[PDB]
């Protein structure tokens, strides 16, 4: 992206498509690292009653 307008135009005329919109490299188009500590769910088997194994 740091490149020049004329070179953008040239590469785009060559290819045929646009590139500044669908680059391959990654300029802050990602999800930040250092994500927050998460909390998780459990299954429908972590109850206290009517969970007798003989059923399942």
């Amino acid at each position: 992206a740091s490149a020049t307008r004329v070179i953008q135009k040239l590469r785009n005329w060559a290819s045929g498509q646009d590139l500044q919109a669908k680059l391959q490299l990654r300029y802050q188009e990602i999800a930040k690292r250092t994500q927050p500590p998460p909390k998780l769910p459990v299954g429908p088997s972590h109850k206290l009653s009517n969970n007798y194994y003989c059923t399942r």
Binding site: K47, L48, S49, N50
Partner: protein
């Protein structure tokens, strides 16, 4: 009929309040030891048939027909002697009846032990009581001294050639010992721990010798039955619930009491007729415990209009036991009450059964949490499932005794617990 409304001429356990003398003299006056000799002549089969005609049932715990319980043992002997045992123990909260029967009517108890031993071709009767009842064991031993010195007991029973013996025993302060088998084991000296049914004491048991067990009230009434006719007795009760009964009313009441009464009587009539009335006003009443800790509560909706008997309590989902009617009102933590009732068991469970030993404490801790609501609801259903796990998967009825109260508390008074929990959460 509207049962109850009894006559103090038919009421049996006279001297209940000790207003008369409890010696051999006052006893003969009251009508003790009357033609016991003629009875010993008549022999066992007649006595058993009399009891069966009477249709009597048992007081201690569930109602097991005494006629059949004793026919189990009616049998020849093979060198193995045969013994009788009397469960004078009384620890079931709300029961103060056998103690009175003993300190105020011991001669009749001895008479009943003698009649039962004669019915079963016995040799002797071991009367096992607790340790705290030193005064009662003393009075009873004194009465036995008098009986021996007179001649109503021993080698020559009363004029016949029947050799019978009486022996007394004290425990050491336990409750489980009031169970048909660990009683025997404590007698023998082994720890107060039960056995497995089968085999049954009626064929194998104490000292490897056949024996029978009996409650003091049953043994004390059987002679009056035998000498009065049996049919007359049965006439004082419904088809199956035949007989009079002892009741112990305690708790939230103007005047707690011990009483004699008729079976299949309305609980409301019982409480409001004797006892001077329930405290604070009937409407303040919340629930009951008609059988001590061995039974679950019941709230107003059935405390009123109900009868009192093994059947019509079973129908009400409960039992009777010792007739230890506790009563409460709208001024107590039912949860704290029942939690202490369960800590009782957590302290007085012998321990050899895994579910007892490791579920009673589970229950105690979960109920101590319920006390303050520091929990969440579904623990309710968890506890209910634990109770249903324990019920039948044990040896002695104490498993059911520890489960039933919780089952009733949670079938009746769930919203109280739910509100306690939400309120505690509110308080953080």
């Amino acid at each position: 009929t509207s049962f109850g409304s009894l006559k103090d001429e038919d009421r049996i356990f006279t001297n209940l309040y000790g207003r008369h003398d409890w010696r051999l003299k006052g006893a003969l006056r009251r009508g003790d030891w009357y033609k016991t000799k003629e009875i010993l002549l008549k022999g066992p089969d007649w006595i058993l048939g009399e009891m069966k005609t009477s249709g009597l049932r048992g007081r201690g715990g569930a109602g097991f027909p005494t006629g059949l319980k004793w026919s189990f043992m009616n049998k020849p002997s093979d060198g193995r002697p045969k013994y009788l045992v009397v469960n004078a123990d009384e620890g079931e909260p709300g029961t103060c009846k056998d103690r009175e029967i003993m300190r105020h009517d011991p001669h009749k108890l001895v008479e009943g032990c003698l009649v039962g031993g004669r019915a079963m071709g016995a040799r002797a009767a071991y009367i096992y009581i607790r340790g705290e009842f030193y005064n009662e064991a003393s009075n009873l031993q004194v009465a036995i001294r008098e009986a021996y010195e007179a001649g109503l007991i021993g080698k020559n029973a009363c004029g016949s050639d029947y050799d019978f013996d009486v022996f007394v025993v004290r425990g050491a302060g336990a409750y489980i010992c009031g169970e048909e088998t660990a009683l025997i084991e404590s007698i023998e000296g082994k720890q107060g721990k039960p056995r497995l049914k089968p085999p049954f004491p009626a064929d194998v048991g104490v000292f490897g010798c056949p024996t029978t067990v009996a409650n003091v009230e049953t043994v004390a009434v059987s002679p009056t039955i035998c000498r009065r006719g049996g049919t007359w007795f049965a006439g004082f009760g419904r088809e199956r619930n035949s007989g009079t009964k002892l009741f112990n009313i305690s708790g939230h009441v103007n005047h707690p009491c011990t009483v004699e009464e008729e079976m299949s009587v309305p609980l409301k009539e019982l409480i409001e007729k004797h006892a001077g009335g329930v405290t604070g006003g009937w409407d303040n009443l919340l629930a009951v415990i008609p059988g001590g800790s061995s039974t679950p509560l019941i709230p107003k909706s059935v405390c009123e209009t109900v009868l009192m008997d093994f059947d019509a309590l079973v129908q009400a989902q409960t039992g009777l036991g010792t007739a230890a009617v506790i009563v409460m009102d709208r001024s107590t933590d039912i949860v704290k009450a029942i939690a202490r009732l369960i800590e009782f068991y957590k302290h007085e469970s012998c321990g050899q059964c895994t579910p007892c030993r490791e579920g009673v404490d589970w229950m105690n801790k979960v109920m101590a949490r319920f006390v303050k609501g520091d929990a969440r609801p579904a623990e309710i259903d968890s506890l209910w499932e634990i109770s249903k796990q324990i019920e039948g998967h044990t040896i002695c009825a104490l498993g059911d005794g520890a489960a039933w109260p919780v089952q009733g508390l949670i079938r009746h008074f769930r919203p109280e617990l739910e509100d306690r929990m939400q309120r505690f959460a509110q308080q953080h």
